A paper describes a structure:
Glutamate transporters, or excitatory amino acid transporters (EAATs), reside in the plasma membranes of glial cells and neurons, where they catalyze the re-uptake of the neurotransmitters glutamate and aspartate (L-asp). GltPh, like EAATs, is a homo-trimer. Each protomer consists of a central scaffolding trimerization domain and a peripheral transport domain containing the substrate and ion binding sites.
To determine the structure of apo GltPh, we used R397A mutant that shows a drastically decreased affinity for substrate. When fully bound, GltPh-R397A crystallizes in the outward-facing state, like wild type GltPh, except that L-asp coordination is slightly altered because the mutant is missing the key coordinating side chain of Arg397. However, removal of Arg397 may affect local electrostatics, potentially altering ion binding; thus these studies should be interpreted with caution.
Residue numbers in the entry:
A (entry chain D), B (entry chain E): 6 to 416
C (entry chain B): 356 to 416
D (entry chain A): 214 to 284
């Protein structure tokens, strides 16, 4: 019945509108009314967007690992990793350098005096690794499990490939029937990801409707100071790092955001990298990148490369050490970077688990969570949370896409 | 070794035989021995008939939604809905009008006098709808979840259709491979659903072997009277509502049960719409209905249109009101209807979940379950339950074939 | 000791502010850090008024 | 006040009949077994309830032998 107004109009139309409906209804104390009446529409959006992730990631990866060289996954990968880490590491120091320039937390006097302690630590690495190799891939699918799905689809595509250069040309028949139908699916899902996305307008209005009602109010004083240093910091990653890394790798910076937003805007309002993926992937395809690349740099990036989390993780770690007057200085400044990289790689792909991860990075330096004023300050951040989360996610994703496009213009 | 005597002979044969072995074995106190010895055979049948439900529902819908226009889904749906509501709401009135005609419960004196209370209410609608959108469709399949499954296969079928209308004729190849192999499955299931059904004669014998053993003896006095009221109420929904709506829509009423029973005699003896559905669907196909209809109106009705439940939910509500002498009259008679509809829509598709729902409808009127004589009376019905449950399910299912054949003769 | 600081909740709930909101809980937390320091003086006058409540009643009995 | 409020109304039909059967059964244990065993043992049957009620009217209303016992 629009009939069809263009999507990046209606999407950008509901965003700036529900942000104002949300802020008005929120600051006039209705946020519960908003979480009753509006919310479930901003839910249905993310609902449909999830529904696809499991097929579209599995299907697209079988195909894409079939239609690329085992040699080249293994190069594109080592590329994306050493690119992913480097971007993540930069975003922390670009966060420290924003909480140094701004000063959130300082000017709330609240010091405390006990640590470390002792303390503990050790990411069980061995177990996280053995874990990407699933033991029932039907299983893996059947309940979320994207990383172990990846490592199957990659193993499968590689084996089908091998089936096609085999002597007996009965199996190459089967090998095709499979890989055709698998592509049948993948392709289908990219059609559904357009379906939803005509819902996006509504879903986007009704998401920042709720996120702005129930947490805009908290953006105040020293908390407001944490927003600005984070926001001005994230939109300094975009410009100082991506556009530069796109310009340098000779892919058009402004045509790149021209690919979009779609995934830039579903990342923002959903605050779910995993829920974004379908849209994130359909703007990899639609921008021409190769499937044997994008269907493995994007589902890995959707978890491992959260530049926006490990930035707020930088500047939040500063706020809570500022509010206690604990000056962190040389050694810790450097062990924030390391651990907030860690903490984001790290974080899960869903809403504010980055904030829950923020605990791992605090404990890394002095302050331990148990001390009331520690926690008092953390609580405060846990009220400005979903407001940070929006921008955090939109860069956690935009760094995945630039990671993809810049690796694939080298391959 | 029969070698192959005819099916509706051997199923009707063990039905009238095992109802007699069971009543003789049960009224001579052995019903335990029969739930030991016989039962695993009545089971194995329902086992086999479940095994299929998931593929056969998924596969067939993909195909049927591919094999029709998105427009017509939308038009066969709204139809089948406003049909289903209407059939269900009559069945309560036809249940009320039978426990007004008979008198179940009146003639047992037991009054009580405390309500409402307060009381509570509000099916969380918001969340039942948002639930029909699953987030792991692999998941949904992998564990029962029929309704979320429907909402996928419809979007998949629709997505595939559009793929065959796409410029690149490499994806149209893939699109076909899929939808073909998918139809490979669906078709195959319909073959196995005949496999079992040659076993049904044993299974039907061994189902009413037990249900009659362990619950025939209770059909006595005021309890026999709710039986008569429901049973005579049920085979009068068949005659006054179905055959009439079949005649009117110009489909042959006797040639319709002549389609059958198959789905009429698994619905009765399993007391499972969900366990029937394979046989419910294979007699939609076998009678010439189009797949882009019957694989969407039979799995939805398998839960949403429960005529026989919403009937015994009116006349059980009566039985319990009469035994307490709590007279219901104007306002409640009409809000038994509303609720016994809601309660059947409502009920789950599996054995005596309707007798469990009977609670929700008791509390909508005065009586709360806590009071000794409400629960005393409710305890008696829980002993006539599987006996009512049989006819109840046989018309829940029969009201889905008619609802299918009468909408498809309109499309 | 400090069950009064836990009780402070009841009295917070009576007015507007609800405990669920982070900045409510943020502030309360801070207070939960100065708590037994309050509790000291608190308890000494919970008892001093119990003694004056006894002495002035028995000087009238 | 209460036990009659929340359980009087149920004394009806076949249920009133177990009431009558028990109640008339109980005030016939009092007469045929106690007063007779009191008479026989030469203690005064009417002077015995004349001891009372106290223990007879807390036993009835509390429905607790354990709660009566002091009386
Ligand atoms: N919800 C975020 C994680 C976080 O930064 O809290 C994401 O999808 O990236
Ligand atoms: N057994 C019934 C449910 C009921 O009425 O209890 C069915 O499958 O439809
Ligand atoms: N209430 C009774 C026990 C009973 O008969 O239920 C008593 O105290 O002796
Ligand atoms: Na990401
Ligand atoms: Na992460
Ligand atoms: Na049904
Ligand atoms: Na139902």
């Amino acid at each position: 019945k629009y009939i069809e107004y263009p999507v990046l109009q209606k999407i950008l139309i509901g965003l700036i509108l529900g942000a104002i409906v949300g802020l008005i209804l929120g600051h006039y104390g209705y946020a519960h009314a908003v979480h009753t009446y509006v919310k479930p529409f901003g839910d249905l959006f993310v609902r449909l967007l999830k529904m696809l992730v499991m097929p579209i990631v599995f299907a697209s990866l079988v195909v894409g690992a079939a239609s690329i060289s085992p040699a080249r996954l293994g190069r594109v990968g080592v590329k994306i990793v050493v690119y992913y880490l480097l971007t993540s590491a930069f975003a922390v120091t670009l966060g420290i350098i924003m909480a140094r320039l701004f000063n959130p937390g300082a000017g709330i006097h609240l010091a405390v005096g006990g640590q470390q302690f002792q303390p503990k630590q050790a990411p069980p690495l061995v177990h996280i690794l053995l874990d990407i190799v699933p033991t029932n891939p039907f299983g893996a699918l059947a309940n979320g499990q994207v990383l172990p799905t990846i490592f199957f689809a990659i193993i499968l595509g590689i084996a089908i490939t091998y089936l096609m250069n085999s002597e007996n040309e009965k199996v190459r028949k089967s090998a095709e029937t499979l890989l055709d139908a698998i592509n049948g699916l993948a392709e289908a899902m990219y059609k559904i990801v357009n379906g939803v996305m005509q819902y996006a307008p509504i879903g986007v209005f009704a998401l920042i409707a709720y996120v702005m009602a129930e947490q805009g109010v908290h953006v105040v004083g020293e908390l407001a100071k944490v927003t600005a240093a984070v926001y001005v910091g994230l939109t300094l990653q975009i410009l100082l790092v991506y556009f530069v890394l796109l310009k340098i790798y000779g892919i058009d910076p402004i045509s790149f955001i021209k690919h979009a937003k779609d995934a830039m805007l579903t990342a923002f309002v959903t605050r779910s990298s995993s829920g974004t993926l379908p849209v994130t992937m359909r703007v990899a395809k639609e921008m021409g990148i190769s499937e044997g690349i994008y269907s493995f740099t994007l589902p890995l990036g959707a978890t491992i490369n959260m530049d926006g989390t490990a930035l707020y993780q930088g500047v939040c770690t500063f706020f809570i050490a500022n509010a206690l007057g604990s000056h962190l200085t040389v050694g810790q400044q450097l062990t924030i970077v390391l651990t907030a990289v860690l903490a984001s790689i790290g974080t899960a792909g869903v809403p504010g688990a980055g904030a829950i991860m923020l605990a791992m990075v605090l404990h890394s330096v002095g302050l331990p969570l148990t001390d009331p004023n520690v926690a008092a300050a953390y609580a405060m951040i846990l009220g400005i949370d979903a407001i940070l989360d929006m921008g955090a996610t939109m860069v956690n994703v935009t760094g995945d896409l630039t990671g993809t496009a810049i690796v694939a213009k080298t391959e």
